[PDB]
Amino acid sequence: GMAMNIKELSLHELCEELKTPAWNVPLTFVGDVGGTSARMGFVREGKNDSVHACVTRYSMKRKDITELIEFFNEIIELMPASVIKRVKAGVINVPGPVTGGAVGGPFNNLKGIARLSDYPKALFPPGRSAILNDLEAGGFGVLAVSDAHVFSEYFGVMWEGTQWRTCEQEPAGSVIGRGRCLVLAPGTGLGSSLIYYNPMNQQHIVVPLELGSQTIPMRKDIDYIQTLHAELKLLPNYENMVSGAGLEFHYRQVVRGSRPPCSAGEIAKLASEGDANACKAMKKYHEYLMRVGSEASMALLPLTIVLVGDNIVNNAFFYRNPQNLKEMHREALNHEMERAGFQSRVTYLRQKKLLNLNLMGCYRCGLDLS
Amino acid sequence: GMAMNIKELSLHELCEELKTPAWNVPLTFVGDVGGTSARMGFVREGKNDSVHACVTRYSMKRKDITELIEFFNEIIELMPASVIKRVKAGVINVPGPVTGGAVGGPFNNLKGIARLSDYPKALFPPGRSAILNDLEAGGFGVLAVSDAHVFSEYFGVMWEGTQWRTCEQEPAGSVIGRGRCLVLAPGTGLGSSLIYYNPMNQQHIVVPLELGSQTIPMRKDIDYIQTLHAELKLLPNYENMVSGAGLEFHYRQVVRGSRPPCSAGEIAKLASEGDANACKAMKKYHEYLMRVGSEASMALLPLTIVLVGDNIVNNAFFYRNPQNLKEMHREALNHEMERAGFQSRVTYLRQKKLLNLNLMGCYRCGLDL
């Protein structure tokens, strides 16, 4: 009964899976491309707008984005032409910027440039293909979850803002809402995209952002910011406070050289076990994330803010704690324009169950290419 | 030449104009509705995607948006049946929020709620009508200028960024460009909208923003910001620095009591005459506008930033001064992320010719229907 089903198989197994009756339907080709590995295969529609994907993991051995073409051709050389003929769209996500929806890179951990024109037209049909940024795909993934009617399975409400009930009929967290949805991916970095709903075309549009690189506006933390400024030799941006590196800094500031310096991972682990210093560090982290939220809540007027990614799912213990919710809520309203209720109109949600949003995003984006 | 013409006429004269052969063509009804006045009439297409509007000025004396209906009915009762038949679409802009392109308000300077359902279907035909927010119309107006091939007539390049040449072959400022365009409207307030470009279908989409209400992030101006904080009893936002009130503040800080306070109008006038203090005040204003630009250049990665509005046109003397332009440019690059060239990617343009972008936006939106 799962609405979102991903099976990871070998290439030979994938080829067998595709010849089963259930897969004798329109297919979308999808590729989730990370630094070390890529997951690529086919997505089909199921009962009740469910989504079934069958992908194969490929190792990016050469650390070269051009290697994707060898994978594409390997699939075309192995798959019967008659299976590939039912491919109606092709969309992949790459770990870097994309011009048009065609030309991807440069990348941090990979050589070369992803070019859609260099891809085989059999997996990437002309006029019905795209290369997306990871957070654009992420944001399309959020739609796909909404579309498959199981938003409440994958996203929990942290708190409901005042706008939700004036704009939406269903319970908060049961759908994305026909209103702007800001997606924040607080993990090692700070990924941001705005999902816009256009009334004039009956369509939701995913807009990648760089919220994380804006200079932190101050509250009553002048000294705290200056400590990081002196350390980074850079005027701090949100990502500086909301990142692995930021968490490590928050920890250092808490323990004041009375306990060893630790990593992001260790800090989160300690925090899950109730270590007060590590928890305090997490709170500082979340204080700065709520500042991204409060300012963007004003700049972009979102109906919702959704925190996504594995880091968020794994840190559920922080978001379930009612005390942490109150402190986050308080900070998310900490803005002069809260006097007119700008910050309190926004519903905040957190991803509460693991899902590769990118794969699903590739799928969902493909549906608008038709 | 003149590919974008807006003529302001009396109602009786407008009525005569519309019965002349040149206007015997599909028409769009348009209304730019502000706090004090409304401009409303008809737009037609001409040779080479040219655009011709005839509008009338209505006073919003009663300060009530419902009054628009009496204007609509006055136009229908006076205009020949023959002219009203040619209306194919009807779009107006209102100075506040709008849901479902239909229901507008509540407003800060006007009583009541704008409802498209109440409006006469002869001026607002079914399935071909909308109510826009002003910044959205503004943003559509920019497109309309681009569409009508005369971007270069209405907008001047302040400076060309690196990105423009990587996706356009024609001169910067000749078209809006296949990329995001951030519209900033520095006037009494500070309006903002992002004209998103969707690469997958080549569509420009107008997304209203509230960039002006964001908390100013610091550079080396901690003390300057605190001076305004202590005055406003509010942590300052961009609009606090970039507004009539902000300009007045800049002037006060420059003269430090030595001269009585002047108004924004007076400050601009003095600055056009070469008054050093007034010029310094305009520098300060523009310093904070470029800070909106530098931060938004990073958050929203635009291909262009376009400064629009009458205040920008009327202040051309400031932007023509090349020392002023260098100072603005330096501040627009004054961001940590300029080390990766993010601020330098962006082409900055200023509106250099008067044109009611909202009326043209209403027009352009009524073609996307």
Render A165-219 in DSSP notation, one character per residue.
HHH-SSPTTSS--SS-EEEEEESSSEEEEEEEEETTTTEEEEEEE-GGGSBPPPS
Asked if the Cβ–Cβ distance from B196 to A199 is below 8 Å, we say no
Helix or strand or coil: residue B156? strand
Q: Which residues of B touch A342 (CB under 8 A)?
A: 210, 213
Asked whether residue A302 falls in the same domain as residue A189, the answer is yes
Q: Are residues B243 and B363 in the same domain?
A: no
Cβ proximity of B293 and B332 under 8 Å: yes
List b or e across A343-368, with b for residues whose CB sees 16 or more CB atoms inside 10 angstroms: bbbbbbbbbbeebbbbbbbbbbbbbb
Contacts of residue B129, Cβ cutoff 8 Å, sequence gap at least 6: B89, B90, B91, B116, B119, B366, B369
> In terms of domains, do A15 and A135 share one?
yes
A113 and A195: one domain?
A: no
Name the experiment that determined this structure. Answer: X-ray
Question: Cβ(B31)–Cβ(B93) under 8 Å?
Answer: yes
**Phi, psi angles (nearest 5°) of residue A90:** -140, 120
One domain for residues A237 and A305: yes
Q: Which positions in chain A touch B335 (Cβ < 8 Å)?
A: 215
Q: Residue A212 burial (CB < 10 Å; 0-12/13-18/19+)?
A: buried
- A30: which residues sit within 8 A by CB, 6+ positions away? A40, A41, A42, A43, A53, A55, A90, A91, A92, A359, A362, A363, A366
- H/E stretch holding A260: none
Contact B290, B241 (CB under 8 A): no
In this structure, which amino acid lies at residue B114?
A
Of B118, B81, B121, give the one whose Cα is nearest residue B102.
B118
CA–centroid distance for A277 within its chain: 29
β-pairing verdict for B103-104 and A4-8: unpaired
Any CB–CB contact under 8 A between B205 and chain A?
Answer: yes
The tokens for B81 are 């049946």
Substitution target from B213, B222, B232, B303 for chain A, most A beta carbons within 10 A: B213
- Spatial neighbors of A100 by CB under 8 A, at least 6 apart, are A116, B199
Do residues B350 and B152 lie in contact, with contact meaning Cβ atoms separated by under 8 Å? Answer: no
Q: Which residues constitute the domain of residue A119?
A: 1-149+356-370
**Total Cβ atoms within 10 A of residue A76:** 14
For residue B199, whether the previous peptide bond is cis, meaning omega lies within 30 degrees of 0, is no
Residues A23-27: contacts with CB within 8 Å, 24+ apart?
A23/A54, A24/A86, A25/A86, A26/A86, A26/A88, A27/A83, A27/A86, A27/A87, A27/A88
Cβ neighbours of residue B241 closer than 8 Å, sequence gap 6 or more: B216, B228, B249, B250, B284, B285, B288
Q: Are residues B227 and B138 in the same domain?
A: no
Sort strands A129-133 and A87-94 into parallel, antiparallel or unpaired.
parallel
Q: Are residues B174 and B307 in the same domain?
A: yes
Angle value at C-alpha A255, between A253 and A260, nearest 5 degrees: 110
- Residue B51's DSSP bridge partners are B4, B45
Interface contact A214-B299, CB threshold 8 A: yes
Co-location of A311 and A300 in the same domain? yes
Give the closest residue to B104 by CA, choosing from B142, B130, B137. B130
CA distances from B263 to A151, B171, B188, B250, B353 (A): 53, 39, 12, 11, 24
Element (H, E) at A24: none
Same domain, A248 and A181: yes
Which of A196, A218, A299 lies closest to B211 in CB terms? A299
| Range list of H helices, A79-133 | 81-84
Q: How many residues does chain A have?
A: 370
Residue B127 touches chain A, beta carbons under 8 Å: no
B208–chain A Cβ distance below 8 A for any pair: yes
Residue A46 is encoded by which pair of tokens? 């199921």
Query: From the CA of B2, how many Å to the nearest CA of chain A?
Result: 30
The sign of the dihedral angle between the CA atoms of A18, A19, A25, A26 is positive
Q: Do B102 and B177 lie in a common domain?
A: no
Within this chain, do residues B81 and B194 fall inside the same structural domain, yes or no? no
Judge contact between B332 and B343, C-beta under 8 A.
Answer: yes
Place of tokens 């202040």: B315
In chain B, the number of structural domains is: 2
Whether B246 and B285 have beta carbons less than 8 Å apart is answered as yes
| Closest to B357 measured CA to CA, from B143, B37, B87, B100 | B143
Inter-residue contact A122 to A87 (CB < 8 Å): yes
B133 with B98: CB under 8 angstroms? yes
Residues 6 or more apart whose CB falls under 8 angstroms from that of B201 comprise none
The reply to whether A313 and A219 lie within a common domain is yes
One-letter amino acid at B83 equals V
- Compute the distance between CA of residue A327 and CA of residue A286 in angstroms, rounded to an integer: 9
Contact between residue A289 and residue A184 where contact means Cβ atoms under 8 Å apart: yes
Q: Does A301 touch chain B (CB under 8 A)?
A: yes
Cβ(B302)–Cβ(B179) below 8 Å: yes
